[PDB]
Amino acid sequence: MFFIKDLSLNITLHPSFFGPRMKQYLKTKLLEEVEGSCTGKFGYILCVLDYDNIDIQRGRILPTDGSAEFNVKYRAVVFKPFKGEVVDGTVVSCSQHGFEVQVGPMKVFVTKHLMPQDLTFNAGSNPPSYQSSEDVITIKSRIRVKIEGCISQVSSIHAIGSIKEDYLGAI
Amino acid sequence: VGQQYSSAPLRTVKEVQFGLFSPEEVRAISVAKIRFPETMDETQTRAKIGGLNDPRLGSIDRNLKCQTCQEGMNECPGHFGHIDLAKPVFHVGFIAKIKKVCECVCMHCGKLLLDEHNELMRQALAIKDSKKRFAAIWTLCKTKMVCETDVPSEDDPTQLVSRGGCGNTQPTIRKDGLKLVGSWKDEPELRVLSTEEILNIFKHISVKDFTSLGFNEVFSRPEWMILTCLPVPPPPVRPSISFNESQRGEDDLTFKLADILKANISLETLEHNGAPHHAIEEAESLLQFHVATYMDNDIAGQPQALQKSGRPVKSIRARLKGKEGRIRGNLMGKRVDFSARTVISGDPNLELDQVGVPKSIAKTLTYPEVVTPYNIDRLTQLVRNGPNEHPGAKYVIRDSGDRIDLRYSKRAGDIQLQYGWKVERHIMDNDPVLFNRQPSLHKMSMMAHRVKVIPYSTFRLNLSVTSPYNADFDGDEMNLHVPQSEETRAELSQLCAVPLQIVSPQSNKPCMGIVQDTLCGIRKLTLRDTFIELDQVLNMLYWVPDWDGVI
Amino acid sequence: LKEKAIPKDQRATTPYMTKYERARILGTRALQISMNAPVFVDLEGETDPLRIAMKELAEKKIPLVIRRYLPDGSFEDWSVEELIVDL
Amino acid sequence: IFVYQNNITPSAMKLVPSIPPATIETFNEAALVVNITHHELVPKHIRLSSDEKRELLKRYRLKESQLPRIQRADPVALYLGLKRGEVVKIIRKSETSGRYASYRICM
Amino acid sequence: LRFGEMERDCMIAHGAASFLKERLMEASDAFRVHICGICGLMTVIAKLNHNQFECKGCDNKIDIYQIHIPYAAKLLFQELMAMNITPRLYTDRSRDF
Amino acid sequence: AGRAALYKEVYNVIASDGSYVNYRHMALLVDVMTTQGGLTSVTRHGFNRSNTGALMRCSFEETVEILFEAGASAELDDCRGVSENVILGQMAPIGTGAFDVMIDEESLVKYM
Amino acid sequence: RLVKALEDIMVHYDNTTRNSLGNVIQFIYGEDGMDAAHIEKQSLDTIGGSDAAFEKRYRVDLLNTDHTLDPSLLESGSEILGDLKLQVLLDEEYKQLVKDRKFLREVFVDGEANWPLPVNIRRIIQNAQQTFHIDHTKPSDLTIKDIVLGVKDLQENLLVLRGKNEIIQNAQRDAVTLFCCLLRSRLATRRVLQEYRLTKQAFDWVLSNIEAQFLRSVVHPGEMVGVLAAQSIGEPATQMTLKKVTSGVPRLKEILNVAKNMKTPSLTVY
Amino acid sequence: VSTSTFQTRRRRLKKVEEEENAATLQLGQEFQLKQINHQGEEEELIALNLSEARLVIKEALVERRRAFKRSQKKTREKELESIDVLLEQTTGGNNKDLKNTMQYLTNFSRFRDQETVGAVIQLLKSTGLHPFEVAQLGSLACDTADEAKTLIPSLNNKISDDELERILKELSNLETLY
Numbered sequence A: 001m002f003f004i005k006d007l008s009l010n011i012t013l014h015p016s017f018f019g020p021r022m023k024q025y026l027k028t029k030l031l032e033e034v035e036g037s038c039t040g041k042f043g044y045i046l047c048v049l050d051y052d053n054i055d056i057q058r059g060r061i062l063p064t065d066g067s068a069e070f071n072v073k074y075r076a077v078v079f080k081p082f083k084g085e086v087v088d089g090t091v092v093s094c095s096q097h098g099f100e101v102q103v104g105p106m107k108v109f110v111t112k113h114l115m116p117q118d119l120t121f122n123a124g125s126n127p128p129s130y131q132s133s134e135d136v137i138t139i140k141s142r143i144r145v146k147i148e149g150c151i152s153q154v155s156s157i158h159a160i161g162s163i164k165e166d167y168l169g170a171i
Numbered sequence B: 001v002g003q004q005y006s007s008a009p010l011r012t013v014k015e016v017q018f019g020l021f022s023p024e025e026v027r028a029i030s031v032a033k034i035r036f037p038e039t040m041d042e043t044q045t046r047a048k049i050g051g052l053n054d055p056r057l058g059s060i061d062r063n064l065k066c067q068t069c070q071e072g073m074n075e076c077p078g079h080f081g082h083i084d085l086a087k088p089v090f091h092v093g094f095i096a097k098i099k100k101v102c103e104c105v106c107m108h109c110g111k112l113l114l115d116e117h118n119e120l121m122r123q124a125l126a127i128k129d130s131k132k133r134f135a136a137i138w139t140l141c142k143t144k145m146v147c148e149t150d151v152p153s154e155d156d157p158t159q160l161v162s163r164g165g166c167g168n169t170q171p172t173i174r175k176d177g178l179k180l181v182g183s184w185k186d187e188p189e190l191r192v193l194s195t196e197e198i199l200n201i202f203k204h205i206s207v208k209d210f211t212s213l214g215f216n217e218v219f220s221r222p223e224w225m226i227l228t229c230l231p232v233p234p235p236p237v238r239p240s241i242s243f244n245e246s247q248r249g250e251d252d253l254t255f256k257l258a259d260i261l262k263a264n265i266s267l268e269t270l271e272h273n274g275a276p277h278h279a280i281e282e283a284e285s286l287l288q289f290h291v292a293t294y295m296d297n298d299i300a301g302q303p304q305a306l307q308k309s310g311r312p313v314k315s316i317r318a319r320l321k322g323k324e325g326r327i328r329g330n331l332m333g334k335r336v337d338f339s340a341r342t343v344i345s346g347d348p349n350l351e352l353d354q355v356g357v358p359k360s361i362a363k364t365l366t367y368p369e370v371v372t373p374y375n376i377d378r379l380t381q382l383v384r385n386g387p388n389e390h391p392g393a394k395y396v397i398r399d400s401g402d403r404i405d406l407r408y409s410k411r412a413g414d415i416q417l418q419y420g421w422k423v424e425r426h427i428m429d430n431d432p433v434l435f436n437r438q439p440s441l442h443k444m445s446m447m448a449h450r451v452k453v454i455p456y457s458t459f460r461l462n463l464s465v466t467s468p469y470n471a472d473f474d475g476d477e478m479n480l481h482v483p484q485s486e487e488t489r490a491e492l493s494q495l496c497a498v499p500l501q502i503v504s505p506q507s508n509k510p511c512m513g514i515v516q517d518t519l520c521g522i523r524k525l526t527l528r529d530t531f532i533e534l535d536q537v538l539n540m541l542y543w544v545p546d547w548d549g550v551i
Numbered sequence C: 001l002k003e004k005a006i007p008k009d010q011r012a013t014t015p016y017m018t019k020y021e022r023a024r025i026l027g028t029r030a031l032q033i034s035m036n037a038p039v040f041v042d043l044e045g046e047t048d049p050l051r052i053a054m055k056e057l058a059e060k061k062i063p064l065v066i067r068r069y070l071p072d073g074s075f076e077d078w079s080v081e082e083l084i085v086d087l
Numbered sequence D: 001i002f003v004y005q006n007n008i009t010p011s012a013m014k015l016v017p018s019i020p021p022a023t024i025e026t027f028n029e030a031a032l033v034v035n036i037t038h039h040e041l042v043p044k045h046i047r048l049s050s051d052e053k054r055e056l057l058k059r060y061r062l063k064e065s066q067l068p069r070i071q072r073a074d075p076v077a078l079y080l081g082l083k084r085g086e087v088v089k090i091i092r093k094s095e096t097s098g099r100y101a102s103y104r105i106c107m
Numbered sequence E: 001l002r003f004g005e006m007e008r009d010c011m012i013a014h015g016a017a018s019f020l021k022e023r024l025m026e027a028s029d030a031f032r033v034h035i036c037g038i039c040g041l042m043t044v045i046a047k048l049n050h051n052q053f054e055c056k057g058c059d060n061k062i063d064i065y066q067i068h069i070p071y072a073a074k075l076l077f078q079e080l081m082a083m084n085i086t087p088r089l090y091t092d093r094s095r096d097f
Numbered sequence F: 001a002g003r004a005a006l007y008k009e010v011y012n013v014i015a016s017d018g019s020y021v022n023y024r025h026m027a028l029l030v031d032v033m034t035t036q037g038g039l040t041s042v043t044r045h046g047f048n049r050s051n052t053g054a055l056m057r058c059s060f061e062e063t064v065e066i067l068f069e070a071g072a073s074a075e076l077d078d079c080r081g082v083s084e085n086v087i088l089g090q091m092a093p094i095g096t097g098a099f100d101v102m103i104d105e106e107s108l109v110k111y112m
Numbered sequence G: 001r002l003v004k005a006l007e008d009i010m011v012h013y014d015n016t017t018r019n020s021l022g023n024v025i026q027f028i029y030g031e032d033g034m035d036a037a038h039i040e041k042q043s044l045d046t047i048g049g050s051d052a053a054f055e056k057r058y059r060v061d062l063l064n065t066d067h068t069l070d071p072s073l074l075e076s077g078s079e080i081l082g083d084l085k086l087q088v089l090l091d092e093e094y095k096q097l098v099k100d101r102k103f104l105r106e107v108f109v110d111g112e113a114n115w116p117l118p119v120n121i122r123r124i125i126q127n128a129q130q131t132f133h134i135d136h137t138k139p140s141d142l143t144i145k146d147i148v149l150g151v152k153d154l155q156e157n158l159l160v161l162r163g164k165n166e167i168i169q170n171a172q173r174d175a176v177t178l179f180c181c182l183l184r185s186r187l188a189t190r191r192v193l194q195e196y197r198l199t200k201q202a203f204d205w206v207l208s209n210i211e212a213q214f215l216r217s218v219v220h221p222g223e224m225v226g227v228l229a230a231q232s233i234g235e236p237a238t239q240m241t242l243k244k245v246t247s248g249v250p251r252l253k254e255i256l257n258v259a260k261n262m263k264t265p266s267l268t269v270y
Numbered sequence H: 001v002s003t004s005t006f007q008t009r010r011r012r013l014k015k016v017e018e019e020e021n022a023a024t025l026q027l028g029q030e031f032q033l034k035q036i037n038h039q040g041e042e043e044e045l046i047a048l049n050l051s052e053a054r055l056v057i058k059e060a061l062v063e064r065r066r067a068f069k070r071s072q073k074k075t076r077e078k079e080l081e082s083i084d085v086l087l088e089q090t091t092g093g094n095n096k097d098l099k100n101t102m103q104y105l106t107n108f109s110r111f112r113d114q115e116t117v118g119a120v121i122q123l124l125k126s127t128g129l130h131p132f133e134v135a136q137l138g139s140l141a142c143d144t145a146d147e148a149k150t151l152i153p154s155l156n157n158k159i160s161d162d163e164l165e166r167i168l169k170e171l172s173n174l175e176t177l178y
């Protein structure tokens, strides 16, 4: 699931930093702008890779403001989830219309009616739980989830999913 | 300009793609749904109606509104509205090409009047190039005038094979004013060419046919030459010069769009209602007029639709029009800041490139010098000195896109400076300027000079740069411009310098000799007859700045 | 395509500096030096970035590469180290 | 190479360019009474091989388009039986260099 | 004061490209707009505060670009749109050449 | 021989007056008049017709009409030219802007 | 109008002169690659005069009791009389002077010798003359191997285009041709010693100053040729305050417009 | 200020079309097998299973805690807090995401030896399935394909019941204990 891609970055720079550690500040600034980030394209950009061989290339100096643009060539580890995809994670919160699970930097969400046609909601407990013959899902339990849909959003990929299929649900 | 940061990644334009507005591309650009010919007044309550100008586009008056974006005027560009016409109508300046396209295609069936079954044609098809391809094809098949079903294949003139169905004769086409006319062939049969019709025809033409006939599948397909809905031009395209309150001030352009809209409603309320069918067309030729008038109002068809007062109305083609028009006048040069005109006179004492600049201007004009170690002392000095002591300054500018009136603000004699700020300061002596004397006939009318700040109200300069700009003293007026970017004064000072153009690459020679008084006397003096004496001679020697210090 | 790069050997064009190049480089530099840029010379007593970068050139200390473009679609890289100054 | 005295049938030429490969050039007496090329105001144009051509194109980086051009019914062009895609090396005097080395493709 | 055609040509002669750019932008017209990366139409809903962009229908909130260009030409483009011709300006080329 | 006579005459225009122009000048003018194929005139029917940036072309007489024919024929401007840039207030790729400038990662270190 | 035709025409970075599209106009500006400023009117002494004075002033023959140089001029001058090894050069050189005169007489039928030429050489040797204070009463020290073998070299160093390719090289030569001819004209061996009065140094200094002052005068790739030349036929024209044939102003217009139906169309039968 | 990748196709204006995603392996036009490298060289897909990831981050973050001092010049349970330390110095202080994921991984991995890991890799990358199918198979447990290709739909007909069966059998072996 987790991926690794080559990417780049238009980073501009003030004529102040035309000193001799310029390189590292470029590295840094990149890490600021990118690390932990998220788009709809790739996804949760987790961490950069191979900090040593970070691709610089000369920088072109912009026509009027002194600044200079660098196209940082780099490559990183990242994370984008998908429809129909299966991943398991630890529960994180519970309501009445369902419960939420955390996987990677991301959160999948499951609604009640996306659970066994016999699974029950116990709000008369603490912390709130879901009951069943043998099953007892709760605050922390680990569960296998079928991601049913992703929804790009600002700086977060969120999603929905299910545990109704076979071989699915708590583990 | 259009300040305040923007998350937007900056770029530059490399290519401009010229295409044609599809009715849906418009019907999607569009915020608002323009239906009302009244600008504003909510039944008279100063504001605007959800019909024209800002139903959800740009805004008049200094109030933030504008579909969310807010921001407000300076910063806001227009947001387009759309106007659904009644029935499709013609473009004005595309009408020549409409005719020349109708002449190459079979109407009613929709296809070429020539295939690869005809060498003079197939050989124009080799003509790679829109302008001359289309041209060879139109010259080629404007003669052919029946929808052939069968042609002599490249074998022999005996067996003709079959390509496309129908044959229904092609009516030879003539244009009249803002209508098209055909005449199918004893005696012809003259029938008018109706829009919707012609439209459908274009709109059933196949893609390859498109292509080979100078048209582009994605950026410009024939249909779009015949408008369904309308690009409704956002507010500051057509800016109202209001007079305080209870008045208005709208634009001719806005009035032509209100006029159009009107006409459209008028037509429409005949096609729902009791149609004197052939009196409906009597009003469609109004829509067809106005929509052609708001694009162009100087055609051949004399009727130059005025507007209540004689005023012809300024069709859009008139804003782009040559000289003074947007391009030959606004985008190929403009009025500009940091400039200065004045009466010029000549002084025989400032080094060639010096240029006597009156106090009132070394006072008026700003150089934005940044705030930096080597100058701080200087900069602050000016600042306190204030915009009236000759060597003063006029604005300080903070790292927060914020000015400071160095003649207003309380903190006048206050403000410490800031490493990374800007002093817009008065104009110092030895500074780079871009002097010049129109008419602009060569490099030599347009050079850079070092400033010498001086009294009285006259521009001052060196007798011998009189010939480069070519200015007499019967009262000639001159232009001056000021650098702004450091590298601006670079290009100026290493390229435009007045002593750079002492040798001219036009006649491979000097273009800045000695003159009048000077020369005239340099001779009167050169003479064998001319013997000077000690007293004077000395005054002479000293008079010369570099004089080694030796008799 | 990055194959649009004329390798530093097999190089082509005038080894001298064009008045144009120069004015633009002196510019760029003075402009960034009044931008609180780092200098690489001793200010023997200079304040104006023009004079400054002038005397940054005469000591060819200026971290600058003229990427020259050749019609069709090519480039040759020439550092101010490299070029000369007859001008 | 065919020479006509005063004219050829407007249907006799109708069967000239229909015998590949070889080609066919009409000509007029009065059009050959004197030498075009020997007039003071012309220079020498020169045929090139496909190799010479492609070499000019690679060593100047030029595309076909980007090259200056010469008509086809240029008197000079007929003189040397010019064809579509061919190239001359015009070569002339100069009050500035003595010799200037020009090029042209054929239209 | 006016600085036009003829002047523009002289300064072309001196070859001072930048001086031009400035004299005719930061010394006059000047102006910032946002453009889609799919249709060179100035369609962007500039949310320069809440940090959203968009030109729905072109369904883009993502590929968009800031650009400096004299307001006069901003107008000219809107105007040529009035006459139904899309002048789609682009950030990059494809023709190469 | 064309280009030639052409110069000669353009030249007797100038030398008739008694002036001095340096060959390279009108020489150029003329090479521009000829190259493309035959005799191209300095006039709207003349050179304007060619292929320049559509935009450049429409800073010469036939504005609106150009832009119309241009937007119909799906034109696409390179912008590799003055007028084009100019309208877009971008630095005109001329002399002082015929080339990019870079900082040099490497050599920047040598200078401390 | 004029200007609007050549705006975008400039000297691109290979000294080709082209337009925004790419299409070429001049292959090397002014058919030479040179720049109107650094150019002054020098006299071509190889093309005029009688064959008499040509032979006199330029002929150098060691194997002759009247044609060899009088050792007053050159130092190593009597230990030269009849040197078969050097006469090999003197004759080759003088063969190049021959070839030249008849090439220049090909290009300039007029007979005109006075011309727009880069690098003022008339003066460069006056600066030299009074810069080393040489005397017209004492002997040189250059070898005749030196002289013509030095010149032979200086030529090469006058580049103008650079590629490593025959096309390019040759074309270059083309270009430099004329100047070369002037070089061979005024660095000729009879001249160096008989007329000028050089010395090892003086000669080597002149060699160098020529070279550089050459590379200076080359056209700067960038310069806006089009607009240039244009403004420069507009400039002399605006000053034409107006032989019975259409002259100037009107004729000029005719011309630019592609003068079809023309006014006075004389026709000169030689 | 946006961030770029290695494959812009023509802005043909034609915006519409690009499909949705599923375990029909159908991914964005950003994640199909053939993707061009950084030096321009075509290269397959880099889809890494759980753990394989944790190792990648740990390591490339160790070379980072190394380089981050080369210029200074002038066990399940335990790995948790050890890395809650490594990050604690190497990040910028905002990667809540990146730390979170470190926990997730470090807890759910099936392998924690650059050895056993590789082993698995050279085992699976034998049936040239989509580097995705691979990954998922390399971070989710099972017994019969009945579970296997049910939770990993993309297979089904691709690799046989009994052979994916063997591969499962082998994987529950190489299953690095905790």
Ligand SMILES: [Mg+2]
Pocket (backbone or CB within 6 Å): B471, B472, B473, B474, B475, B476
């Ligand atoms: Mg006067």
Ligand SMILES: [Zn+2]
Pocket (backbone or CB within 6 Å): B057, B058, B066, B069, B070, B076, B077, B078, B079
């Ligand atoms: Zn708005």
Ligand SMILES: [Zn+2]
Pocket (backbone or CB within 6 Å): B106, B107, B108, B109, B110, B111, B147, B165, B166, B167
């Ligand atoms: Zn038909």
Ligand SMILES: [Zn+2]
Pocket (backbone or CB within 6 Å): E036, E037, E038, E039, E041, E043, E055, E058, E059, E060
């Ligand atoms: Zn869009």
